[PDB]
Design a protein around this ligand. Structure first.
Ligand code: INI
Ligand code: INI
Ligand code: INI
Ligand code: INI
Ligand code: INI
Ligand code: INI
Ligand code: INI
Ligand code: INI
Ligand code: INI
Ligand code: INI
Lengths: 148, 148, 150, 147, 147, 148, 150, 148, 147, 147
């Protein structure tokens, strides 16, 4: 259980996204005792994740890649076109690069830049991060077992 | 007609998903006296099914692959994105690998984590499993036919 | 040339309604081509199983066109659009990569609650779509044969 | 002086034609016949992508135009095809690298009523002219860029 | 120092423009002219993908930016195109592995009114800044994870 | 059980609406040997039914009133508003007048003025008419019962 | 007082499913009130015919509460919400003007395509709603009897 | 066929609304030769129509009242709350005042302040006006026949 | 120093209670016990309007508060009742002319999950305080106006 | 000369305010103070209807105006209230036959952002003007059709 993971994090809503990252890193720390290295990569926004993952993926250096971003409807434009582009983008890359790309590119039904909202997700992303943590291990692990 | 099917089950809502698997397997068993071997492959969540299926498909070890997951709207984030990515994912994969990927990656209009909803799908997935069984059989059968 | 083959891939969900499109489709060609055009029928579990089948059949080079027939309806339990999309996109993709025409008769109603009226309505309508399909098939296979490939 | 393949779906031809006629008219006007437009009949919008690809691959055309009226007729969902097509053309031009212009419009509402049929029979003439320019423009640009 | 191809749709040009002007401005106030931005005009958002692919292929650009205003004019559905363009770009940058930043905006509403116009006319300035930073940040990041 | 019913039919889509009337009347005729007299009242459109029903109801001349209309979305303006106003209207009216107002004021999810749609509803309204007939009978019957 | 009457007005559309709510409703009261509470049943064509009936019955003063039971479902042909609304509003209005409680068991599913699962599901569920109704009826009739009317 | 009609017209989108008025007046002119007087009343917006109709109605001076307004979604706020309030408002008034109130308070699915749009409705309202014209007569007439 | 009738639906009591407790707490705090709040249990939100009317008509209360959590449970449509209630209360206060405050909230989403139950158990405390103020305020205003 | 009761909800007060200030301003610049506007504060939009009924009853007002900003905060559904308030007002002015102008706005979107806030903060000024004119026009019209 010793391999590298490239955590790609969009910078939109950094405080929320960061919570997922921190939580991801911490959980793995607690499960693998650092035997799993998590390299963090910043990226402008979600849209920038697919390509970045593609690149970081083909380097062969990572057992899995994580895409973390908060794509929300800010009330002026439509966030879904990107969300789709990105959730699909990652799926495409991993299908190509055959390197697992876990998604922590969440899009909430509602997020109006309010305390309640902002606090809810600031907190939830932690949960999500832990989920991503386990998923990452589980997948990498099973692929290994699968591998011939 | 003695072959192997890869049953890739996501682990979210496992209790529900398992019902589709158990059913799927039991049907094939009954309908094929055991001729069909169904190898189970766990996976974090639906988003992990495509690649897994590609990886598993390309081994050529299986006559057909089944993607099983319950992708639901949990009232917090949007689920349709991943749902799409996966349903498309499996389609893409099977088109590349030329290996039948059956979809038991279901998305209900409503699943609110209540006795009713859970009881409903825990029960329904059994039906879907049986459906996937007959589908797998039928498709694997038809392909080999048009092959000759 | 007027003589060629068409692989008619039909999903078996709502087989009753899908069948009508087939029966109709075949009848139209027979009535137009006069048997000149052969329509081979392939059964498939559900619409999702159409893309790959169409691809495999397309690659055989035995057909001037493939036809995907299916009724992808919302059953009030799961969302049907996800598959419908994959299928409508799948056929589009298969035909795009295999350069073999794939006509869609994979219909998705706004409403279909399996009630006498609904069943009856579409059972009848699919006949119409089938005819349209036949004409489209002839039209497209033809138009392509007259293309200045330069 | 170049060739343009204009693929026109036949569903709602009365309306599709309208966009194609204005296209031909405009190019004829703006390029005085210099730019040739080859019209290609096609059953429905779904048949456009592949046709587009095939023609683009002949290398004969500077650009291709997909013209279709994909509307919601009240019985089935049109969006699935519309998507497969708007995406299909987009996919073909990205593949063949032959600009594919879209005149595959999908109205919010079109109920086969006089008001509607009349509105779009009219509006497609406008769209067709827009296609014309967009065509000329893009083709032009690709050269300015190729040099 | 590097170059950025800025492909801009011409629909709602005056609004799209603000995005560009701002982008070019911000970069100057950040690269002091180091980063050169070349503007390319294209008919509509649908015309961006292929252009960005073409320009990407050249290798002359560290990143490509697509700017367009794809709104619901109230007659046809714009989401089909919006989707195609957004995917298109993402697809192109994935093939060419050349960053393609999106400034292909689609507002929930835009009814050609003083209020609406004046709002995005100004907001595209903001977005253009964001597009500037993103480009710098992404182009920077890529080269880094490369060395 | 020999009484009068006021059948208020809007004239939009008359060809469709008439089918409900003709059917309504024929059913009562058959089921009541003519005992039930159904007086027909034309009206511009659905929006005109409520008042008309009030006016007609208050005469006390009728045991029950029927509002018949096809209120559809013609793709230009919104129909739901009037649809609502009328369906509520009839309800309001009957609650005031204490006179049963049956609703055959139908609104289809889709009616695009095509052979199919028209043929469909021209035929269906006949069924609805029959339904309204049995409803009228039943309701008038039940009321008089609880009256005794 | 524990002894009083309830007029249970039930629409006859989907009578099979509506009936379950009634059977259940009555059984619950009998199991709680022990016959102390009488439930008179009145049949009505459809939900739309509930408001006025409830009003007429309310005005009789014979009931401590009225209960409207109906399944107002989207049948994939016409919009059901218009009526559903009129009915849910109607009962609310009747009870408001007649000062007589009117409990709603006029349920409208997100989805009901008259398929085995759907029918079965609601056929069973209405039993639950019926129980809830009985409890609500008792609860409300009671709470009102303990109100300081000053 | 000699009576008075109070045409109440909101002033939002006056040019479009006006088309309905002009057309209304003209049609009646052509059918009743002025034997039907149409009194025009201006009103700020649609919301102001109900009360105005109520007042003008109770004066007993009019056989019918027409509400004309164009309530549209201007893209910033929601027009429906008003639309509903108004379409219901008129229905309520006429049910009260028992004076027919015809509705020419149209709400289009789309109207983005564009030439195509603006021209379409500038033209359609004429049609609608003619419809209102006939409806008005028909209703007033039938109510008369109905009257005892 | 006046009386307030607080009608609380019992569906999702755990959450409804939360809004009622904070209401009582606030008034007790702000009015030091001066303002009395009488709690009235009610089966569901639908039972509130009538109760509201009845109580308002006793003339005993300065204001009435309807508290309920009307949510979409995934099986039936909640909006019909929600409407009948938000309108019903509004109708009653317009009738009885006794201000009726609404704490009959309808969440966009509430799936009986921990995250949700926890969020609203929390948020209802906030709403309850808002009710408290709104109550005090409106009652106060009506007097300032009655004089 | 006459008086206009201006009931204003306090939610999003700063925005609602602009509406009022503008209204009062416009009237001054049109009645030179002839028309006196009395402001009444109320907790939320739901609290307007009854107040407008009460104030209407007084007879002291030629017209009543309800101003509120009822937006979708992203947690609960606001349309229930919006509807109740809008209907409420319309209902009240119908009973009391006292004009009740609505400045109870509900934006498609408003996510508590600089852009959103600043936009309605300014637009409510515009709306307030409209509300001014409408009041003058309606109060004028009524008295006319009365004489
Ligand atoms: O990560 C996000 N990026 C966003 N930007 C989109 C994209 O990721 C890039 O930043 C930029 O579009 C140019 O590529 C978002 N919105 O625009 O709303 C958002 O919500 N979340
Ligand atoms: O299998 C599922 N996975 C889900 N998670 C998405 C994905 O499968 C992975 O767990 C994770 O996103 C990292 O890839 C789901 N939802 O989020 O709702 C769901 O319903 N079902
Ligand atoms: O052909 C259809 N298949 C359906 N099943 C999906 C798919 O075609 C396969 O049967 C199965 O999913 C395994 O791939 C449908 N629905 O689920 O609703 C439908 O309407 N039509
Ligand atoms: O060009 C169109 N083709 C349509 N037909 C679909 C498709 O183009 C093909 O004719 C056929 O589906 C299979 O090839 C349409 N509808 O069905 O509604 C439409 O609106 N427009
Ligand atoms: O850039 C845009 N192009 C648009 N045209 C689509 C496309 O970009 C091309 O101009 C043309 O379709 C031919 O390809 C738009 N709409 O149609 O609404 C729009 O809003 N924005
Ligand atoms: O009876 C109808 N009347 C309609 N007109 C509305 C109303 O009935 C009157 O004709 C007119 O509005 C003046 O009151 C309709 N639409 O507008 O769509 C409809 O579908 N059905
Ligand atoms: O009780 C019901 N009545 C229905 N009919 C409406 C009404 O109740 C009367 O039967 C009839 O309309 C005459 O008033 C329904 N639908 O139409 O769907 C329904 O689901 N449930
Ligand atoms: O007649 C209209 N009035 C409108 N104003 C509403 C109302 O009629 C009054 O003018 C004002 O609200 C105060 O009463 C509209 N919009 O706001 O969008 C509209 O589209 N049409
Ligand atoms: O207070 C509530 N009551 C509910 N019950 C409805 C109503 O309040 C009565 O209990 C019953 O309908 C008849 O009196 C609810 N749902 O059904 O979902 C809900 O969310 N909230
Ligand atoms: O004026 C408003 N009041 C609101 N509160 C509703 C109501 O006005 C009262 O304040 C309270 O409900 C007690 O009656 C709002 N929301 O809840 O969203 C809003 O947006 N605007």
């Amino acid at each position: 259980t010793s391999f590298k993971i490239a955590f790609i994090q969009a910078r939109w809503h950094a405080d929320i996204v960061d919570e997922a990252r921190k939580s991801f890193v911490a959980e793995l720390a607690a499960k693998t005792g650092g035997s799993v290295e998590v390299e963090i990569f910043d990226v402008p926004g979600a849209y920038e994740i697919p390509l970045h993952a593609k690149t970081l993926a083909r380097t062969g250096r990572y057992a899995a890649i994580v895409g973390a971003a908060f794509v929300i409807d800010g009330g002026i434009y439509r966030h879904d076109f990107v969300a789709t582009a990105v959730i699909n983008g990652m799926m495409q890359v991993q299908l190509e690069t055959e390197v697992p790309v876990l998604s922590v590119v969440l899009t909430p039904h509602h997020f109006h830049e309010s305390k309640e909202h902002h606090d809810f997700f600031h907190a939830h992303f932690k949960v999500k991060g832990v989920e991503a943590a386990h998923a990452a291990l589980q997948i990498v692990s099973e692929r290994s077992r699968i591998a011939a």
